[model samples]
Target: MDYKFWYTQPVPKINDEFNESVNEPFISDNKVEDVRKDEYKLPPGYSWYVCDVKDEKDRSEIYTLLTDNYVEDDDNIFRFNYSAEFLLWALTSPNYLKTWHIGVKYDASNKLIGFISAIPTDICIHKRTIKMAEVNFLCVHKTLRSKRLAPVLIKEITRRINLENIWQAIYTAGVYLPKPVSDARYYHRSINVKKLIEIGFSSLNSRLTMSRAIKLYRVEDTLNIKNMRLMKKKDVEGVHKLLGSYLEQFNLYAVFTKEEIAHWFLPIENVIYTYVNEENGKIKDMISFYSLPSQILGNDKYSTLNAAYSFYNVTTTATFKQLMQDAILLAKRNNFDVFNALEVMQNKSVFEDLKFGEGDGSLKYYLYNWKCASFAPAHVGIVLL
Candidate 1:
């Protein structure tokens, strides 16, 4: 647990304490000229490149690297399989900088081996809204672990973002880092009970039979809400206003503009799905989920587990429980095996009643160069994919 590298960064130390609110960047008065103009030197055979996600070749390379080496479960049973379409949508949102999509290549073979990326965002913490970067997709080839490339990727991306005058970042990790602003647990609802038990992702209790578990987790095919339909471009402005107002109740949340809403919430096949309850030409309630399937390792029966993660949701007319019930139904109709949600926002209001069992994993939210009073899970309103 020696944090030799993290100790020198601007983040809070392991033993730091906060009795009152202090919502500001840890370091100020930083000048763009103070950042290093040259790229960090890689090992002998590797070179740095700015990944062009628009190009077919570059996109495929990035997709392959992440698919082979990205996050895996504790038992190595499941690995996140972020699609190429999802990467393009996530990395090239509104006002995104191309330089933030960093990659490392083999000098001789021209092979992409390492990558880390950042995207621009504005988040509200307590009473202040600050501009920051959402850093993600840090990965290295499995054969190059001994090269100690992770720290270099972190430092390089930090320098590139610093040159742009953004001094703060938000990220999440399964492992506990030096400190965290909020911590939340995962809850899962089974959509395909037989498939889940077959893949060993979950199991039947000693007292309950498989048939009973299946009956316990069964969902209705038709939704109960009235006038529920897919979100369209016409509903962008209303959805934005509704979500903005609903998110204000939390201590930390992302502030989305109309363009961001259209880009993120607009339905993309096999990427993102958003629905709304519209009556009288006005959106009353909204729900959204994104597709992130996992590659089931060493499984003979199934190769992928389609997961639907709860994104931004708002409830004003329909009950929170009922809105989420419709979400489950939508996901079930789309053939998702499981639906996952974090214990943030008002999710707990419907989780127990709707039968989302607690997951064993905990996700820690971290802010670089920014610190404040810690918040409970209910105070967290942001969900990062």
Candidate 2:
């Protein structure tokens, strides 16, 4: 509970308060030379390694480290298994620096033991846009968790990001840090009900039977909307404008240029999927999701659980709820086992009618340095992979 490391960082204190709307960095801007010239030193047996996700060996090392030690449910029934492709897609956003993909390794073995990553982004708080880094993939080897490596990884990543002259960051975690800008609850709609119950990810009540449970969460096999189709390269500019307008209504959201929007939302086979309803040369509705599978721990029948996390969506022609229904059906058609959404945005409006049960997990969002008004979960519009 000391949060000794965060205490020295730029984040606000646990007791920090904002009585009115405000958007300002806690720490003033620093010149590139102001940052440390050398990488943070590691203990004697370890060294800092810049990871290149495009390389086969480096990516596998990262994949193994995270697969074995990444996030797990309270019961340890499942652990996040972000695929190698997912990591590449996530870290290689527009103008992503290789230095942001940081890792720690032993001198003798050269085995990657820890990792933390950052990607440059423009975050709009209220209406002010700030260039910031979206930090994620912080994982330390399970055996070395007690060594306090996480703090060092955090510092190293911060230093690397600082070198790029970026002044603020956004990150999220399952655990509450010093203070959270906002928090969103997880909600899930079952696609493969039997696989979910078998993996202990879900359970049926005494009032319900297996058949009834399956019937309860089933979604249609085909697309519901007539004009909906996979988002194409030609739709980039329209999507950028439409999504940007829709996101402006939120208190906190991301600001993306057309290039960033294309890199993020363009269909990438199994990695990212975006569908849009275009009519008369205009994008009317848009929905996006990413594939992230979890390892089925101690389950013989199932080795993995495929999941689709809602990314960003905006609707005008069809109701938002209807768009979500089509989202579920699209994910199901892709053979996804579950469709997961958060309390952020207007998602909770369809939770009851869509049969998405409240999950035990609640993710807390944090801003690295900037301090501003803390708003409700519904006001949050950013989703990090």
Candidate 3:
């Protein structure tokens, strides 16, 4: 594939070596004054609009676009269906700006056709903390794919971030772009094997029948930790302390504030679910998962694929393997058909022993306007919803 577009960007070339010894931006001069003063021009029929996700009007437009247009499985059997509440949680992190939620609308009908979003995030790289933006959900209407709108959206979002004087940005994709800081594979465990196979998301085992397969993947019921319970407002401070200290070992990770912890880890009914282990006077371990159900394209019996994505986790007393097993049981109890996790952190440790099969695609982590050495699975602690 021709990298003509990426050639103009600041990302490292595909042939570049992992030779970065210092952590910094690729271009030193990212002054706010140097950034383009105007939004990138859209072709004649379209214009730019900043999205207000809090408003039901703006939220529904974005939700509709993404539900029909965002990521899909390689076979096109399933597509990501981010809910309205999930979008609010992701985009409205602490100190978020409305301008960062950009959109493109047709000038005549004034309907949204394109979008790209960023949220303020401070990341730690090689023991150095830097201000950055976490970019996500870059989408364009299928009809406009041939119009070459993606390149403009990228430039517009970058320009908007530069205007804020933040030079670096981080994102994840299943496709390879210019270059990646790390590549992580996905692992999935079957919580309800019957539903998965019925939805065609998974197949029956070669050597076993449906009942045998279900019996093999049945999750354990008992909790291994001593005092594991659901997370609440009072545990936010304790979890914040453990999360910060636990994330230090990774070479690349997102930095979170106490407030962000509350927003991310405090359990919301269907969006975010979290649990913690309390010992004596403080929190020892915590585990969490988020609901990101997939839209079943044309399945006769199922309309959605209920999935739980493994989020941040800390294991102090119980083994990580055991903690993950407990997580699977909780997800099953909550009616999640499948539990998904990336190999970004220590998650692979529990894969084989817990019967987690590998996924079809690999996720690549990329950074804009920054160059750094590639990271191992254990060295990457960041998860972008």
- Candidate that scores best on lDDT: 1
Model 3 C-alpha lDDT per residue in residues 1-385, reported as the tens digit of each score: 8888888999998897666685678899767987889878899988899899999889999999999899998999999999988998989989999999999999998989999999999998878888999999999988788677899999998888989999999899999998988899999998888888888877876688898988999765788885778998999999999999989889889888998999888998779999999887699999899999999999999999989999998898988999998898889888898999999789888899999999998999888888778877767998889
Scored against the true structure, residue 5 in model 3 reaches a CA lDDT of: 85
lDDT of each: 0.91, 0.89, 0.89
Our model 2 lands, by Cα RMSD against the true structure, at: 1.2
Q: Please write out the lDDT profile of model 2 over residues 1-385, one tens digit for every residue.
A: 7888889988889899776566788878578898888777788899999999999889999999999999998989889999998888899999999989999998899899899999999998877888999999999888887787888898888888888788899999999897898999999999999988888887888888888888888776666587789999999988998998888888888888899999999998789999999988988889899999999898888899999999998889878888999999989888899999999999999999989989997999999988887888999988888
Task: Please give the lDDT score for candidate 2.
Answer: 0.89
- Model 3 weakest 10-residue run by lDDT: 16-25
Against the hidden true structure, what lDDT does model 3 obtain? Answer: 0.89
Question: Which is the better candidate, 1 or 3, if ranked by lDDT?
Answer: 1
